[model samples]
Target chain A: TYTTRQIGAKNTLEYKVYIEKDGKPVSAFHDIPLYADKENNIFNMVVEIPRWTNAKLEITKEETLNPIIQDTKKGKLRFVRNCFPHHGYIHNYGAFPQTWEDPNVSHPETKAVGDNDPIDVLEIGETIAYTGQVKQVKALGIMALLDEGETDWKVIAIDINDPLAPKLNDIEDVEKYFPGLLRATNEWFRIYKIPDGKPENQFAFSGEAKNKKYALDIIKETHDSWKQLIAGKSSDSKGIDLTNVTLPDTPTYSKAASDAIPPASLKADAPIDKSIDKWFFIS
Target chain B: TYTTRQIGAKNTLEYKVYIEKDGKPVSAFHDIPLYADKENNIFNMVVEIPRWTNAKLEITKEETLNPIIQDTKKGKLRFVRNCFPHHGYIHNYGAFPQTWEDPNAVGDNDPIDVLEIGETIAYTGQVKQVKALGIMALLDEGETDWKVIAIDINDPLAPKLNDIEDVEKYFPGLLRATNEWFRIYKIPDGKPENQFAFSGEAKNKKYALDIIKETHDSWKQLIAGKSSDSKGIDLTNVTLPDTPTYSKAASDAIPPASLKADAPIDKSIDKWFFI
Candidate 1:
């Protein structure tokens, strides 16, 4: 029995929320571990296209007042340049709410990077997700961008309800279906910084983007990474493998559109924190 | 007054360094700030293709000697990527020797990361003439590391990159390069993971100039104790208070009347001072 609260009756709201099937959440980020079943190993993830393509509202797990970048529980949220505004996030982007990359966990391969925050996802679909809405997405593959000695993995997924959903299965499907899109995505990441005015920021659309056959496991490992975030130790202590992890979604329609699409993303009306100096150091 | 000494031939040879020009105390990285004119603002830097892209002897301010990462004073010694081992630094690299990034100053315990611009490797130990231009902010493992972007007015191939626009004219694709580099380097290697993300924000040459200026100003401030330069989180200092704050208006009275917590039994009561 999933609950879809018809909240905002006495509030300023455009829609209701069909809370996660097993997830009974406060619409706001209440810091809940985003897993539907931490025991079963199911994880919730999604993709977000920028306001257009290159522009974005940097959100976080805390403060709903986003527009600035803030990765929950990572470090303090401020602006970083290498991702010059002249450029924008090339693909859909979002991150698992309760997950983290865990700076402590060494990558299984390359063995040289890991940034200790939620794993990222770039959703490829016909859907336009407003900032801060969690949707059901299927992991298709992984794109690796190596930065400052850490492995930053960007998950490639298609919205479960995407028009191309039926045609996509994995990174291979992505390759077969959306030709050049991957390379384009990789290419975009490489150049976004130069416009910001630094000759070299030092990262690449790494060779780490792997086959879709590997998505399920990557998702699972990240769930494990999530577990590490919660338990605050190596997953070795968890000791058992998440052999039965299954991602299950909650019911939709508290009294709204079909369960297929999320309400037009929670509106981007975060009142800006004007006092931030308006800009950090160089601002 | 300057001396270049070759000292590391005794124990390790993969690390035998013929210390750079001018004056050097001993070879090998004892983790000193690399500066030619500490009086002037010139610094050495280079472009690292990746972990493997440059002609550099890897030195870490850290004793953790892992093959994963290490930086020469700033650019050139070939590094960046959180340490991908496969990619070369697209930006100039190097750091100031004899200069301590003063863990107290910023970026956790990291020494400052300098972006050297001259076409030449800051001829080790050579005091080259250069000018402070700007700074690119970077975060690794959530620690704030400022990449001091300086220009070697001395290099023939180098341009007059004294201002931010000068950087655009001289470096051209540099901003995008470092931007991308900073955006992703931490994902794969940062200990806590997802340590950093990009701003997707734009900063003009003027903004960069402000950053470089403040960093330089606060750098002196770090040495000069705290000042207005310390107002920004990007910068810091050392100073004891004019007087101590109340340790004991008298709380959980283990004895406010001078007890033996720091109680070194070997000294006098006056040596125990606050005792």
Candidate 2:
């Protein structure tokens, strides 16, 4: 189990969400273990951008202790465009901890390099996850999103506690159960950047969603990449801060790291952009 | 099983595709049964326009034997605009044989439309057995045009998609695309965005079947001369032997099938419409 601490002001660039376990500051990116149960293939997902929210909250790759922060473009905090029929972020969007999509890595199938981040996950569970919430999820499927020539794989999963969990065992099961979600998810990802003045995102395998077995293989591969990354064995570790209080014997770990980390406290949130509520009626 | 015979010249104003069964001529609209298996809820679909094609073929409601013919507007043969991201008709576009959308009785009246989302690109005038998965009401130019989403029973995905919900679950973006395609398809021709009932959402199979049943009843009234505008449509049919409008002499007087090859499709039909 984990707890979230509001590290900075919300709805602003200073807003950062920090995660802790056992009252010790932990890296939402580095310290939290990838799997809740490895034998059963359950994963621990740190939610950064909750469902139905426009804030582009993500784990800061270079921030100390790697707190979740809203992504910025040209000094302005980014808010995703609400494509019609979908208000905002459609799912509890987050990333699996201890999983790095190494930029040095390339897949012949995707024909691109990694997106230099943790593999993204979309929780299809009915409940909206909060920022920094840790969820135990089962991998259902994977879609290879070729974002700006980088391999950004979106893992589709459901909470084990979700009512539809037992009924959804694989990607086909998701198709049978949710009907249109896989396509809607693909469309959301493909066109989400369009309103940002970017071309529609492309996908490998013609946007076909892969099954659980294929998704698990990807999870394992990215997990291995994270191991190499934290061990300082990665070919390119540029732009990433490895600072942490956990993971003993590593180069960045420190016993006095707790003192250096910021304490969690509640602060009045900054006013959000009124334009964030605006929707795009794209054809 | 049914076979088709060509009438007049193809790609011209006179082009007509007629259906026949077991060496005897039959009305594609009236003689063909709606159900392939009613207990299983399988339907008989007459493919008038196949996927990736542009010709707007439909059953001529006033024609003798009700042969499938190219629809015209302003005296020119009609070919549907090819909406971008879609080459032409995305699915096997067709209609149910024994159904009608009665304009005089209620909403936008025409034949009930069917889109077979199967893998195969069926031929125009081909009869296929299908399962209805869902329906969408396209209020085109103020008409209640209901589009039934279906799948050919012979398709590989048939068993997987038992209902409309399955289409979204299995095919994902298809339902969304279907609505979008219909909504903006006419914009290129100086038409406004098409409106939809139910906020452009696809209804479940049970609701779709109910609409089909209602339209089927309208078709019965149409052939029975009970529809307010039934007199305007010719009920002439050869295989409908028991109907008051059936005539053996009229069937015999019909012209024989054309032996000449169909005229080549216009080069303009091959052109794409980006909008």
Candidate 3:
């Protein structure tokens, strides 16, 4: 049986939130703090937008999932199309507050040059989690992505975890159970930045962390990164040499990707092959 | 008579935090989300050290003040080094949640901000009350950079203040000194003084307190996820619309204070103006 413990109130704001194991109502932010059993990382996935929303929403530090408004910080107070007209996040996204991805750590694979922020996670489930609903999530895959040279790690997790965790073991399990979710996850990361004309993204998904050990290792490593940070040790100057770490190839442009290039004016004698066109075209 | 109301768990991590009046247990992240009574916009100022800090702790979203960290963003754990280096925050600092400055409108300012009075060392997530006395503005990349001038009710140096005039009388010369702090903190680190500018000429402590209350009310609508008129406010939920991470802010995203010139303009690269 999972246990509930009471942590004391740390601030001045007071309100009653989730209750304890006992049926007593407890005061939050006034009297004490609340903790869950170890299996508590299961989170509430707040979607800023459903799947193809042009308007963006997010959860600020306070866990309040709100729309992302640059002018006002939430929705423009309401959901509206982007002036740039990009789709909403391709996947249901939010974060676990307890998690951190320290950019200071030089991991053996991607090096320590990540975005130096909290890890971005995608929660996949039968039903999309609500803006404020909490669900237990099981880790499935890790996407080691390089967005503009910063290591942005996306943790792919499954939600509504009540008894469904063991069933979804790895990427293969996701392919079997969810059908289109995995591809959605991959393609979303690949194309989301493009609509905004951001720098190209290159990602390599790691199914190696299908189990808890490697997954925990990733979280634990970054956890220590934050610790080193507070101690004033995780400085960029103190960063490991990333010269040899290497990155995946840049965004790929291919023959099939753009079969019909701009109508070529080249007299059929041009040496540049039509097969490799995105690069050699002269306007 | 000042009143007390609780803001409850802003995030999920279940740590010890203030209990609400309703008698229910709340989950806090690793630390506490700080606040004051609705009337306590009277703030104490806090500063971040780009000059001294690792990129670990960021305000997320836009990275000015407002959002302390991102749920899936920076510094989910650990707080340290208001020193080792020196002159950590110019004074105490904190923010009022449920408040925002809507950058799309003016491309300036974040949520409701506060500057505590005295020298008490508040942690990364602790909210306490202070008698707010004055307000100042510093624009970071065209964003409104607000500074709080107040007396920490908890700080030893706090003079048990109650209102604005009390601040002027007991904290004599603070407004001038605070305005100066914003000016020089950047000089030693090699920041240009013109890139950023600030103003604290709101008339008096009452005016500062009033603005805070106004700001506090603004976010109250926002945190509850509502929209508004005036203050160029809007309907906003806290999630990030744009990517908070993935980009490097200028080397001088943090560290601030004040008003006046003639003497304040010196630090000129990592420059911020104390107008």
Candidate 4:
């Protein structure tokens, strides 16, 4: 059974979305009406999400015309691919929904592409294969692409493996990685790119242009190689020897041979007698 | 013509002998007077001999035979040939007196020769040639047989050649041959023979000897020859070489080849940096 629909007729649908924490509904947005325009229908829907879950879901506001308002509410988000600010537009979906795309892309503004390209986004409690050989777990915040002339924002985790915990603030954990470690201030921001072939458990940041991250496990491997060289652990260490060093000269006495003759006191009594008798005759 | 008519009584005359020194008189016999044997007509003579002069005179005592006594006073004594005390008896008519001939000739009560062989005679201010070379002016008092002692009695005005002046006492002088320098005391009484070669001019009796002056002069000549061989005068106005014929051994540092290869410092630095 099908009913005939009139052309150019308008209809509105109203919906509400609730933001929650730890199984408790902390905040809710309601009376947001969805309307079908000439090209698309704007629709809003609600979903339950946990803190640091890193779960991402899409609510398509239109069945066609490429979803006008896709919202990811109260969950970690990442830019799955490179994106430009001009390519995406933000509207008041009235639901505080976050959005992202794949950070690896061929676009000039983001420029990261292929499997070896650096990750541009992170989601809390999400395990993502990094540009290097290893994978790291993202534990907090929505990694978002900023507007033109603005730096991108990053998600930092105190402990990414624990999904049930709340995100820590600066005062709550003094030892946590801070804005200082990321070279972040109220106005200037920086994003750390994790390099390939780095260890899964370790991370680092570069201070120079195009700031990048390095895994500590790869650094350990390099340090071990250096140790083998310096500690004589390898064949190259045995090549050096000290036998060619020169020696000091000593002085010798010149008159030693001439001085070996007998002393004057020993020969003082020579030529004991000499003479003849005057009176004896004939012989 | 009987013997009683021709003979008138006639007697032969008698004579005696006398000895003297320098024309002065001295005693000959020990205890008896000059006319002790009055019947024999033997007269004993006394003489006063001047220094270094001898006298020989012949006298006919009682006209039986003439006997000559060659008398020598103290000054006439000359250093003749040397004689050992063990030897005996001097022979020949004019030979100089020597040591005793017979070891047992004299009794214990008899007066023996007062001087022994090699003994020094007392100083009497006379010069004599102990050898043919020249006179010896200085003498050592006590010297044994086979030990030729030197005699250097001082005389500044004497000739220099072969003159052994007592340089330890007076200035240098010349010495002549045939000059008497010393005389020997006979054996039987011990002589002062331990005199030094150069005693001072005081001439104490203890400072004289029968020195072998000839050998000493020969030694001087030999030393002069050595100096000539060295192309220099006999040690006169010249200093001797410090290293005379002998030198002692020295302790020296070891050579560089003996040290290890890795010496702490350089050879040049080691020379300047000693402990």
Candidate 5:
């Protein structure tokens, strides 16, 4: 139902994700609906970064209409370390679209402010998704990461079409099927930064993965936050643009304005770093 | 002449900068002499993160023989922000060898950081002679992390700018940007704006020189085991003949430079930045 048009050369900071629906421009962050199937508890997952990929790609909050862009460090493209046992990222990692983790909102459970980004979704499926790939996923559990004093929630999900999806209905079913995945995921987040000269990341709930009910509640809260953000109700928008093409009667909505933006990119992708394949063995 | 042996793979967190002199292993952070020409008041600057390049590369304090490695944040390679009006780092950023900013002292527990505000872009591990212009006390996490602003002796404007006042007169706004760069660079990473001592002012060259001297003395004390804190830093070195930490075994521990080809830098290294 959704397609992406590249806005700039890949591997470059100028690279942007231009999304479309039926030949009309839309926002991956703003226009994408949170629920793909509202009655079935299924959600739309906008895959900014793919499985095994290293570049820190995210849907931009500051860009007009919001596009996914590769993050930079210092002046070069940033890549995540390949923690041992896990070659790169363990699964198809992404985030739930049309959802914002409001920084102003404090979670009683995590006891930390939101990370001011979209709720993260880790898709455990048989297929490796592409960048900007939108998949219908079902939430199975949630993990609360206290990242530098911010509550960065990691939602464990599965593609509804995956073979294992039928058996793994909740968090316990995941343990029954993939015995070591949750522990590995926890350890991956914990020690991944040690090689980078940072202390290990601390997690909430003693790093336990909560059930699906709690996870859905978080998704609802984040979705509501996005509602306030898009409606200009947020006091701290954090430079996010409210521009949208589909959502009318809003502060930043115009068919002409969205079409006024430049067409799809003609620039080629910048070469990815070969060292991205290299792994680090942190002591 | 000193040369670097590429250790591990490039761009990876395990990548390291191994230094050698006269075909023997030497510590880049230790064996390298601090004074390039002591009589001329020129100091050696070990360039880590070069101008316009990112990746928070630093001489390892905890690693054996102290090789240079890229720093990380949130499990990804850490990069500083470009800040407005600056393409990347405004200078050839690096540190002085054989110098320690003792945390136990008045300064942050790291080597005295130096920024060469020269025209030429320096390569990683390139040692160049630079003259100090001034110093800014960055109170990072409540620690005095002094940033010494210097210029390469070979730079076109080096001769013109001899003091902190001269930098302001000639360069104009560079010092202020330097201070602001440190203050807001971490904000993108969700850290609060960094505070600065002395109301965020750059001190004169004489004061910077005095601070450098104090840091050098502290380095001497550190290598001699006079300091109470080691923080697991490998003090082993081939140089510093006057210091008790000088050891042949420690110097020999570093393997010979490999004949392996250096890893290719990411093509994005030359990518333009408007922000």
Candidate 6:
């Protein structure tokens, strides 16, 4: 079911710009500027399309300004809202085409107009409208740099609930989410949580006091020694070498011949020779 | 001796203010504010014994306009230049009795005007004139902090020269000097220079590079495992353990036999058993 209306005789101009690659249009839109009189519907539409290297726009006039146009530039028009410079708005709606070939060689101006530049408008009734289409090209160059894998980094996210999480416990979790996100971000990144305090029963002031007393005594001894040395009351002694000094004898074992005799070596009434007897032949 | 000379009649005034401490007048200085048409030096100098803790300003007129001077109700006259409402200059001078008592409590005001305030100029000189003396006092305080046996502070003048030469190599001689001076004044209260990069070798990258590499490799091995076992790879593993798990059969010692004999007791068999 199609609805049609006969547009009255009028002088209307149309303009359009296209994003092109390799002398072929990738994406495009039409812009029509309008001037209208106060009488409800009478209007004159004018459009100026900028030159783009990868795309082009053509205008046509009909007898009553209404015709079944079969031109490559003529098509059913759609309205877009809030179109502005530098804002990314989709003019051509579809799966964005991948720019495989360099358009710089074939179309210099298409590369010059770039992806987000405003290239379209529509004039209907008394309204003058402009629409911009943005092309999202794949950032292959930056993707290449990320693939180099020279950087070492790490990501750390602390658990606010856990009071005693072990150091780098989140490493495995972060690696699971985004592989090598941590290694790519941090120079020397490590995550650590606070340590658990000593158990109540283990925490004692007596041991601490004793340690303090011992430390103080050692400090006092050092001070006294220093004082004596400063006053020239004692001769400086060389440092003692305790590594290999012998101490008092203690019980130890000595190896001796065993009492057991093998059945094959045993002989009845075997006379022991004096010279061979020097080395015991047990039987 | 009394000295007097009169260039004009009628308009004349003389006043003297004395400083007192501990209920005794210590010293007195006479400041006569004179608008003299001609230089007239006519004044009777009084030798009033100073009273402690009771300062008195006395004025006596002899010839024409008899001016009577008495102790003003104000305890002390606030000197205009001496009282700095904002940032004031600090002065230091050698232990001039009062200045030594309190070095910070001195400023320059006209000695005569100071008399009106009943305040004596403890010190009278340019602020810079007293800087050396103040530095001496500061040095004394520093020495006190350093003298305690617990605090092992190095002498400011005899600073360690190891860092100085290295700093001099990288920076200009003036910068080295400046750094050395800065180190003296801002001596890290309890910290020792040895704790910092004290030597040139500490700042050198040659030795540090190997250490940093070792640390980085250790961290890498600790953070990332090689293979799939989740165990850290042996990046620093120079050698494996070589402890013996089993002994050779020949090295094993046989158990001792029982002391009980199978037959009757025999000493002859004991000698045989020992052999």
True contacts kept of each: 0.00, 0.00, 0.00, 0.00, 0.00, 0.00
Model 5 pairs whose backbones collide = A10-A269, A10-A270, A73-B79, A74-B79, A74-B80
**Model 5 spans > 4 angstroms off:** A266-269, B1-275
Per-residue lDDT of A25 in model 4: 20
* Tens digit per residue, CA lDDT, model 3, B219-256: 44444434444243222222323422112222123222
By descending lDDT, how would the candidates be arranged? 2, 5, 1, 3, 4, 6
Candidate 4: CAPRI quality band: incorrect
Write candidate 2's Cα lDDT for B144-220 as tens digits: 88999999898867889888888867666778878888887777668888888899988989999999988899888
Measured by TM-score, how close is model 3 to the native structure? 0.32
True contacts kept of 5: 0.00
Error of 5 at A57 (Å): 0.6
| lDDT tens per residue, model 5, B13-48 | 657777667766677777788888887768998889
Worst 10 residues of 3 chain B by lDDT: B265-274
Please tell me the TM-score of chain A for candidate 2.
Answer: 0.97
Q: Name the candidate, 5 or 6, with the larger lDDT value.
A: 5
Q: What is candidate 3's lDDT per residue for A1-283, written digit by digit as tens?
A: 2122212221112111221113222111111111123455443332333433333333332211111211222322223221111123434565443334665555565654766554566765534333323345666766676666666777677754433566876667766665555554555555554534564466654413244445555655654564444333556523321111011121211223112212212122113221211101010
TM-score-sorted candidate list, best first: 2, 5, 1, 3, 4, 6
DockQ of each: 0.01, 0.01, 0.01, 0.00, 0.01, 0.00
> Which structure is stronger by TM-score: 1 or 4?
1
lDDT of 1 by residue, A1-283 (tens): 3333222221122323333334333322213345545553334553333422333334233322111233222333232222312223445576765455656657875475466556777876643454446666666777766654576677787667666777887677876766656765665555544444534323333454586657556666766765554443554422211111121232210312223333324443333232221101111
The stretch of ten residues in a row with the least summed lDDT in candidate 1 chain A is A274-283
Q: Candidate 1: which stretches are off by over 4 Å?
A: A1-43, A46-87, A196-208, A232-283, B1-275
Error of 6 at A89 (Å): 55
